[PDB]
Amino acid sequence: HLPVVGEDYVEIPDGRPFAPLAGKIEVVEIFGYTCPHCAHFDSKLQAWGARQAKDVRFTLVPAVFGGVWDPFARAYLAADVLGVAKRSHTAMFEAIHEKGSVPIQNVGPDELAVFYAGYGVQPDRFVATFNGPEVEKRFQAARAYALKVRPVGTPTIVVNGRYMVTGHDFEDTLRITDYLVSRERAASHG
Known part of the structure; x- marks a missing residue:
């Protein structure tokens, strides 16, 4: 069936995309x-991302959900600032969920710096970045976006800051996303 509001996705009141659209369809x-669902989804999601037309802007936004989530949100952002997020993303999931080489509980900048040291990041630079203003800015932006979006758990797909997918499984999630992306695209033609 075609996705139905309240079953397959919900509309975010006064929703705003994570970044200005500028002709694009934003898929966040x-x-x-720390989320094993996210770890499991990532390969399917990345493949989906690579399949998208050029008008799709696919963006990762880390969940700033408090507790254990926050160091890892900050890890992602620091990695991204440092240009090593994409190359280390799968490895970070694997380190946490498969290898157990990066702990979830009480993880800190020194476990994280060691991890990113593997990607050519100087540990002092990792620490400076992790503790720094650019990351804190992005961290607050991510937190604000989660407050606006109001996800229940992860992964959560959000189209144009307006439609939050509520899929039953990874494939359904991507199918609903496809529908919403196509619908945004059609809406752009008037």
């Missing part, structure tokens, strides 16, 4: 590294 995944 709110994820956490």
